[PDB]
Scaffold this active site. Structure first.
Site, PDB file in Angstrom:
ATOM      1  N   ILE A   1       0.913  -1.151   0.000  1.00 18.64           N
ATOM      2  CA  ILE A   1       0.000   0.000   0.000  1.00 18.64           C
ATOM      3  C   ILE A   1       0.951   1.198   0.000  1.00 18.64           C
ATOM      4  O   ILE A   1       0.940   2.020  -0.929  1.00 18.64           O
ATOM      5  CB  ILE A   1      -0.921   0.001   1.246  1.00 18.64           C
ATOM      6  CG1 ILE A   1      -2.152  -0.933   1.087  1.00 18.64           C
ATOM      7  CG2 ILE A   1      -1.218   1.493   1.414  1.00 18.64           C
ATOM      8  CD1 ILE A   1      -2.676  -1.031  -0.365  1.00 18.64           C
TER       9      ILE A   1
ATOM     10  N   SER B   1      -5.235   2.203   6.043  1.00 12.17           N
ATOM     11  CA  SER B   1      -5.514   1.180   5.026  1.00 12.17           C
ATOM     12  C   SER B   1      -6.129  -0.080   5.638  1.00 12.17           C
ATOM     13  O   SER B   1      -5.413  -1.013   6.026  1.00 12.17           O
ATOM     14  CB  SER B   1      -4.244   0.796   4.296  1.00 12.17           C
ATOM     15  OG  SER B   1      -3.553  -0.264   4.949  1.00 12.17           O
TER      16      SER B   1
ATOM     17  N   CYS C   1     -10.074  -3.137   0.249  1.00 12.35           N
ATOM     18  CA  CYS C   1      -9.908  -3.187  -1.212  1.00 12.35           C
ATOM     19  C   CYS C   1     -11.337  -3.357  -1.727  1.00 12.35           C
ATOM     20  O   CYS C   1     -11.859  -2.496  -2.453  1.00 12.35           O
ATOM     21  CB  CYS C   1      -9.006  -4.325  -1.599  1.00 12.35           C
ATOM     22  SG  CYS C   1      -8.921  -5.630  -0.271  1.00 12.35           S
TER      23      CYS C   1
ATOM     24  N   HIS D   1     -10.673 -12.648  -6.141  1.00 10.90           N
ATOM     25  CA  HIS D   1      -9.489 -11.799  -5.943  1.00 10.90           C
ATOM     26  C   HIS D   1      -8.003 -12.002  -6.244  1.00 10.90           C
ATOM     27  O   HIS D   1      -7.544 -13.135  -6.451  1.00 10.90           O
ATOM     28  CB  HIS D   1      -9.376 -11.445  -4.463  1.00 10.90           C
ATOM     29  CG  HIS D   1      -9.190  -9.977  -4.173  1.00 10.90           C
ATOM     30  ND1 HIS D   1      -9.140  -9.027  -5.181  1.00 10.90           N
ATOM     31  CD2 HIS D   1      -9.016  -9.302  -3.006  1.00 10.90           C
ATOM     32  CE1 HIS D   1      -8.943  -7.845  -4.633  1.00 10.90           C
ATOM     33  NE2 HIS D   1      -8.890  -7.987  -3.327  1.00 10.90           N
TER      34      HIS D   1
ATOM     35  N   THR E   1      -3.080 -11.131  -1.597  1.00  7.33           N
ATOM     36  CA  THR E   1      -2.664 -10.149  -0.584  1.00  7.33           C
ATOM     37  C   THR E   1      -1.354 -10.687  -0.009  1.00  7.33           C
ATOM     38  O   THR E   1      -0.775 -11.651  -0.533  1.00  7.33           O
ATOM     39  CB  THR E   1      -3.814 -10.028   0.435  1.00  7.33           C
ATOM     40  OG1 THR E   1      -3.770 -11.254   1.157  1.00  7.33           O
ATOM     41  CG2 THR E   1      -5.155  -9.855  -0.227  1.00  7.33           C
TER      42      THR E   1
HETATM   43  N1  LIG Z   1      -1.829  -5.854  -0.159  1.00  6.26           N
HETATM   44  C1  LIG Z   1      -2.820  -5.301  -0.888  1.00  6.26           C
HETATM   45  O1  LIG Z   1      -2.962  -5.515  -2.084  1.00  6.26           O
HETATM   46  C2  LIG Z   1      -3.774  -4.387  -0.178  1.00  6.26           C
HETATM   47  C3  LIG Z   1      -4.838  -3.737  -0.759  1.00  6.26           C
HETATM   48  C4  LIG Z   1      -5.635  -2.925   0.014  1.00  6.26           C
HETATM   49  C5  LIG Z   1      -5.380  -2.758   1.347  1.00  6.26           C
HETATM   50  N2  LIG Z   1      -4.333  -3.403   1.897  1.00  6.26           N
HETATM   51  C6  LIG Z   1      -4.016  -3.253   3.347  1.00  6.26           C
HETATM   52  O2  LIG Z   1      -2.617  -3.048   3.470  1.00  6.26           O
HETATM   53  C7  LIG Z   1      -2.112  -3.611   4.678  1.00  6.26           C
HETATM   54  C8  LIG Z   1      -0.944  -4.503   4.313  1.00  6.26           C
HETATM   55  O3  LIG Z   1      -0.847  -4.630   2.881  1.00  6.26           O
HETATM   56  P1  LIG Z   1       0.560  -4.360   2.170  1.00  6.26           P
HETATM   57  O4  LIG Z   1       0.846  -5.444   1.205  1.00  6.26           O
HETATM   58  O5  LIG Z   1       0.482  -3.117   1.370  1.00  6.26           O
HETATM   59  O6  LIG Z   1       1.565  -4.466   3.410  1.00  6.26           O
HETATM   60  P2  LIG Z   1       2.981  -5.167   3.660  1.00  6.26           P
HETATM   61  O7  LIG Z   1       2.784  -6.440   4.388  1.00  6.26           O
HETATM   62  O8  LIG Z   1       3.673  -5.367   2.366  1.00  6.26           O
HETATM   63  O9  LIG Z   1       3.621  -4.203   4.766  1.00  6.26           O
HETATM   64  C9  LIG Z   1       4.247  -4.785   5.924  1.00  6.26           C
HETATM   65  C10 LIG Z   1       5.690  -4.331   6.017  1.00  6.26           C
HETATM   66  O10 LIG Z   1       5.725  -2.973   6.542  1.00  6.26           O
HETATM   67  C11 LIG Z   1       6.866  -2.805   7.369  1.00  6.26           C
HETATM   68  N3  LIG Z   1       6.392  -2.440   8.735  1.00  6.26           N
HETATM   69  C12 LIG Z   1       6.077  -1.197   9.240  1.00  6.26           C
HETATM   70  N4  LIG Z   1       5.692  -1.213  10.479  1.00  6.26           N
HETATM   71  C13 LIG Z   1       5.753  -2.554  10.831  1.00  6.26           C
HETATM   72  C14 LIG Z   1       5.466  -3.235  12.025  1.00  6.26           C
HETATM   73  N5  LIG Z   1       5.040  -2.623  13.141  1.00  6.26           N
HETATM   74  N6  LIG Z   1       5.633  -4.569  12.034  1.00  6.26           N
HETATM   75  C15 LIG Z   1       6.057  -5.170  10.922  1.00  6.26           C
HETATM   76  N7  LIG Z   1       6.355  -4.644   9.754  1.00  6.26           N
HETATM   77  C16 LIG Z   1       6.179  -3.307   9.773  1.00  6.26           C
HETATM   78  C17 LIG Z   1       7.663  -4.103   7.324  1.00  6.26           C
HETATM   79  O11 LIG Z   1       8.589  -3.982   6.258  1.00  6.26           O
HETATM   80  C18 LIG Z   1       6.574  -5.120   6.982  1.00  6.26           C
HETATM   81  O12 LIG Z   1       7.080  -6.307   6.387  1.00  6.26           O
HETATM   82  C19 LIG Z   1      -3.304  -4.308   5.334  1.00  6.26           C
HETATM   83  O13 LIG Z   1      -3.897  -3.421   6.274  1.00  6.26           O
HETATM   84  C20 LIG Z   1      -4.262  -4.518   4.163  1.00  6.26           C
HETATM   85  O14 LIG Z   1      -5.621  -4.668   4.533  1.00  6.26           O
HETATM   86  C21 LIG Z   1      -3.532  -4.204   1.177  1.00  6.26           C
END
Ligand SMILES: NC(=O)c1ccc[n+]([C@@H]2O[C@H](COP(=O)([O-])OP(=O)(O)OC[C@H]3O[C@@H](n4cnc5c(N)ncnc54)[C@H](O)[C@@H]3O)[C@@H](O)[C@H]2O)c1
Ligand SMILES: NC(=O)c1ccc[n+]([C@@H]2O[C@H](COP(=O)([O-])OP(=O)(O)OC[C@H]3O[C@@H](n4cnc5c(N)ncnc54)[C@H](O)[C@@H]3O)[C@@H](O)[C@H]2O)c1
EC number: 1.2.1.12
Lengths: 333, 333
Positions: free
Chosen positions: A11, A118, A148, A175, A178
């Site tokens: 995100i 998010s 999403c 979908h 994720t």
């Molecule tokens: N992934 C998608 O396609 C998508 C779409 C819409 C909404 N979301 C929302 O995004 C969030 C995660 O998706 P993403 O793929 O973008 O996230 P992600 O898992 O890729 O982000 C996690 C990463 O952020 C960092 N981080 C920051 N603070 C952290 C902490 N306290 N602990 C651990 N890591 C931390 C680390 O690098 C960790 O691995 C969820 O809330 C999800 O509902 C995701």
């Protein structure tokens, strides 16, 4: 604006990326479990979307984004983390766990001021660019941006319910993957969704489409509920929706309702391609909730079937940023 | 014999399944995360290799694997977790962290005795079938079973060397599987190997090839080295090799030497077949390292290139078991 970010990982990237190209201003980045050098290659280089551009390099205590001075914080647990640094009074949290005001607001102690997120939330402000309108006002410290799935739908309802009213309708979302979905097979975790997979299985799964919708557009707020199916489809996704209706239908009537309306205010939200069965391309088309006619459209008097879409991963990027601006102005205005 | 396991996950399923059908006696597996009910569904449950007969069930805080009363142990860290307790005399180890006497003996701590492990082991006895011969005697309390790659490999030498002595061997693995490889793109962790994939984008990387091989006949040790390529392929795998030597050659000649010898001592290891290029079928063909003349073949006198097959999931298993029987008998003697 002036902001920072929880979770360099999906995100975020865009949030940062979009905020830069898309929207604007300056900031800072908060990511323990991802380091300096990484932020660069990482954010820069991404499988779903391609590569960055600009320059993805670090100089002085930090990372240089189109030189727009930017920084990384390691920290686990916001509190620990500054944020004070840079002054990113408006913060965006991707996250996972971090859901709800406490931890959100907690952010404040470390620094923060305003927080927008998010992911849905049971307790706390809930929002999206679709129907948000007057809803959000200064009273507010923190707010959230629909899942999403959720953000995509809210739009669809509008013209259907308002124009067609709407009684009884259910749904599914086929979908794109994720963070949570795994390779080969094995354990899993909460709410399970049997984490047995990736390339091998079309996987059944659920969601809070109802609640979210309702709150995004209450009236609805009960007349709906949903579930879902995950495929290897990495980035990007489409939703199927069901409904029954008071005013009588014409498939010609519907897709049109949306079209004319579509043109209107909504914009960052909507779409309507008569075009023609586009699979899941989009994926950085540059669209919010974006739907079509025909597809697998079908018709009769009070009962009908509709389908819209997503390009989540990204799409969400633009209505958080979308909101961040609304938010920004709103609050400080 | 008598055994127990470190982490119901891949290898284990078989480790156990096999030991059950293939070898025997029974067990108790170790895992804080994987639970009671969980186990039965899980093990019994693998689209990849299939679904189990007999029946996998939870009773009086035990798992009933084809009856044969069974135990599950919830401890984080072996030492911590009992063993003997349940009567687990031989102990295989399903992890990378634990590799080496340190943690190894640890199991001993809780209550073990003989240890056998999934993966190489620079520190400690290391081994493979072909060469495993006399090598293993009561002397040792713990021995290491080589990697997916390595075991498949060691086979190459045996034939290449005795057949042509050999002064120059190199290689490439068309690999797949393993968790670390994360969906989409993000962190990954130590050593790089970029967990930047799955479906989109293939991933470069290195490991157990030349180096290890040695211990299974160092003679060769040195005239070799290795790296690998991984496809979004869930299970099955293929190795490519190159060498120069003392000669007397033809791709025909070679496959023959291996064929004849194949039949010979080795049997449950080796193969030949033909079938043009077969495929990655061998997903539970029911063999150890298995190669084929044809598949792919190239030739220049003092130098040639060859290919082999190792169904990592299913394959290594037979061989660890294969050893569990050898070890067992070996020491007790
Ligand atoms: N992934 C998608 O396609 C998508 C779409 C819409 C909404 N979301 C929302 O995004 C969030 C995660 O998706 P993403 O793929 O973008 O996230 P992600 O898992 O890729 O982000 C996690 C990463 O952020 C960092 N981080 C920051 N603070 C952290 C902490 N306290 N602990 C651990 N890591 C931390 C680390 O690098 C960790 O691995 C969820 O809330 C999800 O509902 C995701
Ligand atoms: N994957 C293969 O094809 C293959 C082939 C040969 C050897 N191996 C060996 O297998 C190991 C991992 O590969 P795999 O996929 O077959 O295993 P797996 O990753 O996929 O097995 C790990 C299991 O151990 C559990 N676990 C987590 N932390 C643990 C801990 N501290 N102690 C004990 N258990 C813990 C996990 O929850 C999981 O159930 C490596 O040692 C590797 O060398 C793998």
């Amino acid at each position: 604006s002036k902001i920072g970010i929880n979770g360099f990982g999906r995100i975020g990237r865009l949030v940062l990326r979009a905020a830069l190209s898309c929207g604007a201003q300056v900031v800072a980045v908060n990511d323990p479990f991802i380091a300096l050098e990484y932020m660069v290659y990482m954010f820069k280089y991404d499988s779903t979307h391609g590569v960055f551009k600009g320059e993805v390099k670090m100089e002085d205590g930090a990372l240089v984004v189109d030189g727009k001075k930017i920084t990384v914080f390691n920290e686990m647990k916001p509190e620990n983390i500054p944020w004070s640094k840079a002054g990113a009074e408006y913060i965006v949290e991707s996250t996972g766990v971090f859901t709800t005001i406490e931890k959100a607001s907690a952010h404040f102690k470390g620094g923060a001021k305003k927080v927008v997120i998010s992911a849905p939330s049971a307790d706390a402000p809930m929002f999206v660019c679709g129907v948000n309108l007057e809803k959000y006002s200064k009273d507010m410290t923190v707010v959230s941006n629909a899942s999403c799935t959720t953000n995509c739908l809210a739009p669809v309802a509008k013209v259907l319910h308002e124009n067609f009213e709407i009684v009884e309708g259910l749904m599914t979302t086929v979908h794109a993957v994720t963070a949570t979905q795994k390779t080969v097979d094995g354990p899993s975790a909460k709410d399970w969704r049997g984490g047995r997979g990736a390339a091998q299985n079309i996987i059944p799964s659920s969601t809070g489409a109802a609640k979210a919708v309702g709150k995004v557009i209450p009236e609805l707020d009960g007349k709906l509920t949903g579930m879902a199916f995950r495929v290897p489809t990495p980035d990007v996704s489409v939703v199927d929706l069901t409904v029954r209706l008071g005013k009588e239908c014409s498939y010609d009537d519907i897709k049109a309702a949306m079209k004319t309306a579509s043109e209107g205010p909504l914009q960052g939200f909507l779409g309507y391609t008569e075009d023609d069965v586009v699979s899941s391309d989009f994926i950085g088309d540059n669209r919010s909730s974006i739907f079509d006619a025909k597809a697998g459209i079908q018709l009769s008097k009070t009962f009908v079937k509709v389908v819209s879409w997503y390009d989540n991963e990204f799409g969400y990027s633009q209505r958080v940023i979308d909101l961040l601006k609304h938010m920004q102005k709103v609050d400080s205005a």
